[PDB]
Amino acid sequence: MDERLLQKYRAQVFEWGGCFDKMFEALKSLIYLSEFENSEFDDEERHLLTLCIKHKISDYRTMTSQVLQEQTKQLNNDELVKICSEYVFSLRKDIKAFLQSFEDCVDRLVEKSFFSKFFKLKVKSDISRYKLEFGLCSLEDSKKIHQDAFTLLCEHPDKIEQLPLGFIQNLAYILSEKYGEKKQVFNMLNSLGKILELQIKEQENMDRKAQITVYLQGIK
Amino acid sequence: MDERLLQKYRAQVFEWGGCFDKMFEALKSLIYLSEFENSEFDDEERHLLTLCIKHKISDYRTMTSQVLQEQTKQLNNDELVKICSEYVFSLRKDIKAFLQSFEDCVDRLVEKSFFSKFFKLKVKSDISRYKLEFGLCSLEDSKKIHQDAFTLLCEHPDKIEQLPLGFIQNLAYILSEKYGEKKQVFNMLNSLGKILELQIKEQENMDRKAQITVYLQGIK
Numbered sequence: 001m002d003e004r005l006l007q008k009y010r011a012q013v014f015e016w017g018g019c020f021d022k023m024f025e026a027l028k029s030l031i032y033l034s035e036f037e038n039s040e041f042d043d044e045e046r047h048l049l050t051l052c053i054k055h056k057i058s059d060y061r062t063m064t065s066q067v068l069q070e071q072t073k074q075l076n077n078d079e080l081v082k083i084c085s086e087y088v089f090s091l092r093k094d095i096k097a098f099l100q101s102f103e104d105c106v107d108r109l110v111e112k113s114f115f116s117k118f119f120k121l122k123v124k125s126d127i128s129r130y131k132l133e134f135g136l137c138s139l140e141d142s143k144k145i146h147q148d149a150f151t152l153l154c155e156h157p158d159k160i161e162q163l164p165l166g167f168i169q170n171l172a173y174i175l176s177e178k179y180g181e182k183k184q185v186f187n188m189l190n191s192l193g194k195i196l197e198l199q200i201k202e203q204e205n206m207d208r209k210a211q212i213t214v215y216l217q218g219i220k
Numbered sequence: 221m222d223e224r225l226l227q228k229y230r231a232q233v234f235e236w237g238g239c240f241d242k243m244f245e246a247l248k249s250l251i252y253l254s255e256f257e258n259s260e261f262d263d264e265e266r267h268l269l270t271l272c273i274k275h276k277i278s279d280y281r282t283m284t285s286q287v288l289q290e291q292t293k294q295l296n297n298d299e300l301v302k303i304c305s306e307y308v309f310s311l312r313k314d315i316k317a318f319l320q321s322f323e324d325c326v327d328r329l330v331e332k333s334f335f336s337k338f339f340k341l342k343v344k345s346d347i348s349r350y351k352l353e354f355g356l357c358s359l360e361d362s363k364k365i366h367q368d369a370f371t372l373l374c375e376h377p378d379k380i381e382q383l384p385l386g387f388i389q390n391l392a393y394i395l396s397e398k399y400g401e402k403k404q405v406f407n408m409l410n411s412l413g414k415i416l417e418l419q420i421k422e423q424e425n426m427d428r429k430a431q432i433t434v435y436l437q438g439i440k
Contacts, residue, residue, distance in 0.1 A: 001299050005299070006303070009299065009300050009303040010303060012300070013287060013300075013303050013304055013307045014307075016286050016287045016290045016304075017283040017286060017287050017307065017311070018282075018283060018286070019283075062238075063237040063238060063239075066236050066237060066238070067233060067236045067237050070236045079221050079225070079229065080229050080232070080233075083226070083229040083230060083233050084233055084236075087233045087234075087237065091237070
């Protein structure tokens with residue numbers, strides 16, 4: 001066990017203990033080590049990275065809502081209300097800081113495999129949606145990152161099976177329903193569908209035909 | 221609003237946000253301020269103090285049990301198990317440190333009212349039970365603190381109504397069921413009962429008679 005494996009273990013154990021700030025410190029070390037050695041993350045490392053932001057955001061939401069709920073039930077205590085507001089503001093400043101640091105890390109992810117390139121853009125897209133909500137980026141800049149991930153997917157139909165189908169569906173869903181690209185997405189996926197139909201036709205192996213069909217169906 | 225009131229507010233707000241370590245820092249400041257001014261805690265300050273230890277202990281228990289549960293479900297990963305054990309040990313060391321610091325604070329509580337004297341001993345008793353479990357005190361030393369609180373209660377039957385009835389019942393319950401003083405406790409409470417019967421007999425006011433009866437019944 002070297003430092004990189006230790007940090008995977010520490011990140012998991014901190015996640016189990018609900019210590020998301022210590023988990024993030026271990027992940028920062030993973031990012032640095034992988035970058036230093038120019039060695040792509042494995043899937044367990046990627047999963048811990050996305051769990052970290054999920055948890056930090058969820059905590060922020062819970063803590064904020066708990067304080068605001070209690071604030072409103074205090075009758076006529078202007079001073080206590082001000083303390084609640086100050087605390088709520090600090091929590092928001094801290095989550096914004098977290099998003100900035102986490103995004104620094106994600107930008108430094110090593111890319112080699114097709115999935116690693118798509119993964120970086122997917123996670124950057126996810127970050128941009130939080131940054132949109134929290135006053136850290138424009139709608140234009142957020143949309144652009146989602147478009148970049150969708151473009152990469154569509155430029156390499158031969159490698160579609162290297163990507164999780166749910167990532168594909170969520171990106172399609174977000175771009176069409178939230179960014180007003182329903183027409184672009186339907187058109188691009190129509191084309192991707194045809195390319196997969198051909199892949200299926202040309203694939204001799206019956207089990208492989210069925211595997212590609214999962215994506216073809218998933219895309220419709 | 222002065223610093224002492226601010227810290228009451230900060231302690232409450234940190235409790236609402238589930239930030240028990242920040243809550244404890246605010247309480248440490250309350251303790252120092254009250255000690256400095258020789259000015260007894262009010263009941264809201266006392267309640268925040270006992271909430272703090274309740275929460276810290278509950279968190280420790282949850283975090284420990286979560287990590288141990290996951291540890292056992294990993295098949296053959298000796299290195300990850302060792303990391304889990306190291307983390308579990310650190311959490312225990314930290315809760316022990318917390319108990320030491322919290323006990324320092326409680327020892328520095330200002331005493332003036334009868335209830336403030338009983339409260340200090342009651343909280344010290346509660347701390348001693350955790351310290352017993354965590355290897356920080358002997359059974360003898362824990363028992364002694366519980367006896368000191370029970371003695372104070374019994375030496376001042378005229379002031380019984382200044383104490384919460386549940387505190388009295390819990391102390392009686394603990395001393396008789398956990399410290400093998402069933403005989404002492406039954407005897408002392410028999411005597412306290414008789415003193416309250418007399419107080420009731422001698423109290424002209426009917427509403428006051430009923431108020432004392434609540435304690436007389438509670439004690440049986």
